[PDB]
């Protein structure tokens, strides 16, 4: 009937494609049925995905959460007065609303105010929410990590690494271009007025 084509929506689709891209023909329909290579690929997948979403502002991985449990910091330093726990699902703190003074210190956020605020952060998301360019970028990146040990040729590994870097730029562009660029929140020569 209708010709259908769509992006990966499951973790297995990413991993099986990545195993194909290191040029290994062994069948991976499931991680359990994929042998020793599939389990190692799954282990590296878990580290890679969170590392990638935790080191860059991807729009599709952004989330917000109100913080209200803010407790006194005593003894303290640098004039900070309160601390609050960074939520467990927060993978990278990005900024706070409203524009209050704060620092990330240890696993806490230190503030000089007690009012409820909102945390804008990055979070892990399932493959069903990934943009298609990001999915192919992860496929190449995971293949690059597996290829460290199993790729025969240095030139072939360089080709895989080139594919990883190519789709990283295209995925970053596709994610970024959909919205306008936000202004700086600190503009001293204007704010002083």
């Amino acid at each position: 009937m209708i010709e259908l084509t769509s992006a990966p929506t499951t973790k297995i689709e990413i991993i099986s494609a990545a195993i194909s891209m290191v040029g290994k023909q062994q069948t991976v329909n499931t991680i359990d049925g994929g042998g020793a290579l599939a389990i190692d690929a799954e282990k590296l997948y878990d580290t890679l995905v969170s590392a990638e979403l935790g080191s860059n502002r991807w729009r599709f991985a952004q989330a917000f959460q109100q913080i209200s449990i803010i407790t006194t910091l005593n003894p303290t330093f640098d004039g900070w007065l309160y601390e609050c726990q960074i939520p467990a699902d927060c993978i990278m703190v990005q900024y706070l609303y409203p524009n209050i003074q704060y620092i990330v210190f240890g696993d806490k956020i230190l503030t000089k105010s007690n009012q409820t605020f909102t945390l804008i952060y990055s979070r892990n998301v399932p493959v069903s929410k990934w943009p298609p360019p990001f999915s192919l970028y992860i496929v190449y990146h995971l293949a690059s990590m597996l290829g460290i040990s199993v790729t025969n040729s240095d030139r072939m590994l360089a080709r895989i690494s080139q594919g990883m870097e190519m789709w990283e730029s295209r995925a970053l562009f596709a994610d970024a271009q959909s919205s306008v660029t936000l202004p700086f929140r600190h503009n001293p020569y204007v704010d002083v007025r």
């Binding site: 860059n56 990005q94 190519m166 562009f173 970024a176 700086f184 929140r185 600190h186 503009n187």
Partner: protein, 62 residues
Amino acid sequence: DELVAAAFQANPMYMAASDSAFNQQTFTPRPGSIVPVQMVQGEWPIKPFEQSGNIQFNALLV
């Protein structure tokens, strides 16, 4: 045309794979400040927006 051009030619603007190259919310424009910047994103580094045109030509006809 000059007013349109000046907005992205006179102002300091940058090109990158993504506007996530630095955090606009924590950007700190202070003397001596270090800004964390992803100086390369994939194949493309962050660079100043390309200058183009012949400003003097336009202000010779005007």
